Design a protein around this ligand. Structure first.
Ligand SMILES: CCc1c(N2CCOCC2=O)cccc1S(=O)(=O)N[C@@H](Cc1cc(-c2ccc(Cl)s2)on1)C(=O)N1CCC(OC)CC1
Ligand SMILES: [Ca+2]
Lengths: 234, 52
């Protein structure tokens, strides 16, 4: 995360960290229920086999509330293409159920029609992760959050040098130095309605980090809500 | 009109079906007696910033 503020006690409880064999974090994730984790398909190329960390806010020291869960089924989207990052969605099934507490809680899966009419029409969204603080910098040891505003489709396409599909959406600033970076990928993008947070996007890609005239590209959850529900049965 | 004006007084989802607003809640919530508010069925519901 470039700029923004850090996640406090109970602020970002839907955050999940994907760790390798050396406990090093490579990608973010979203908690949906006791057994399911939402992430990006490109994240399943960094390290394999991998594990899931929940209730983590600081990497350099263990905190009272951290838990390690192992993946049982890896439901990666078959239509994923590394050349454009289209269909960048993955659902993970865990062996043991998640216990919900102060730093561990899921995020609601909204209804397709209501999310397009009410959630997408909102002014801002919230992104979190253990990603880079600067474009060329190192990954943050502390969990950070950022308030990113929704960008219209026409302005999104005209700014990008790479193709923007129907499964993608723009969010962030035009000139201000506030955007998501490398390491935040696969992480959550939540939209607030009253006092409840709903899953709206997945941290995917972008032309650098916080670059002027460029925005952050996210995987549109609305186009995959029927696919997520089918994945939660098997 | 209806779901367009103040989300039809619903706490969560709003959907129209041959006049009159219909409110619905996500997994881990139960619809209140008024048929608008969402009441949690557990101590840790989804989308809520925890304190305890
Ligand atoms: C144009 C984006 C891009 C690509 N992509 C991705 C999708 O479209 C084609 C393409 O060229 C590939 C390599 C490098 C770059 S980049 O210009 O250097 N931007 C990089 C830098 C970056 C950007 C982000 C963001 C993700 C979500 C945001 Cl919001 S910002 O995370 N890392 C990038 O997008 N990468 C893809 C994923 C990652 O691998 C784990 C690291 C690199
Ligand atoms: Ca830790």
């Amino acid at each position: 995360i470039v700029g923004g503020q850090e996640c406090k006690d109970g602020e970002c409880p839907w955050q999940a960290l994907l760790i390798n064999e050396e406990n090093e974090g490579f990608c973010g994730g979203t908690i949906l229920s006791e057994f399911y984790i939402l992430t990006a398909a490109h994240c399943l190329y960094q390290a394999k086999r991998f594990k899931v960390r929940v209730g983590d806010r600081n990497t350099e020291q263990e905190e009272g509330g951290e838990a390690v869960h192992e993946v049982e089924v890896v439901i990666k989207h078959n239509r994923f293409t590394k050349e454009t990052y289209d269909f960048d969605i993955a659902v993970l099934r865990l062996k043991t159920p998640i216990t919900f507490r102060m730093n561990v809680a899921p995020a609601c899966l909204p209804e397709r029609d209501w999310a397009e009419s009410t959630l997408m029409t909102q002014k801002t969204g919230i992104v979190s992760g253990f990603g880079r603080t600067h474009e060329k910098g190192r990954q943050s040891t502390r969990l950070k959050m950022l308030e990113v505003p929704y960008v219209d489709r026409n302005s999104c396409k005209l700014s990008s040098s790479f193709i923007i599909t129907q499964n993608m959406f723009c969010a962030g600033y035009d000139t201000k130095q506030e955007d998501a970076c490398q390491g935040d990928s696969g992480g959550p993008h939540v939209t607030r309605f009253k006092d409840t947070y709903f899953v709206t996007g997945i941290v995917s890609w972008g032309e650098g980090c916080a670059r002027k005239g460029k925005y952050g590209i996210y995987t549109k959850v609305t186009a995959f809500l029927k696919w997520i529900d089918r994945s939660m049965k098997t | 009109k209806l779901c367009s004006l103040d989300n039809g007084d619903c706490d969560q989802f709003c959907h129209e079906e041959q006049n009159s607003v219909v409110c619905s809640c996500a997994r881990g919530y139960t619809l209140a007696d008024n048929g608008k508010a969402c009441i949690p069925t557990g101590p840790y519901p989804c989308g809520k910033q925890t304190l305890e």
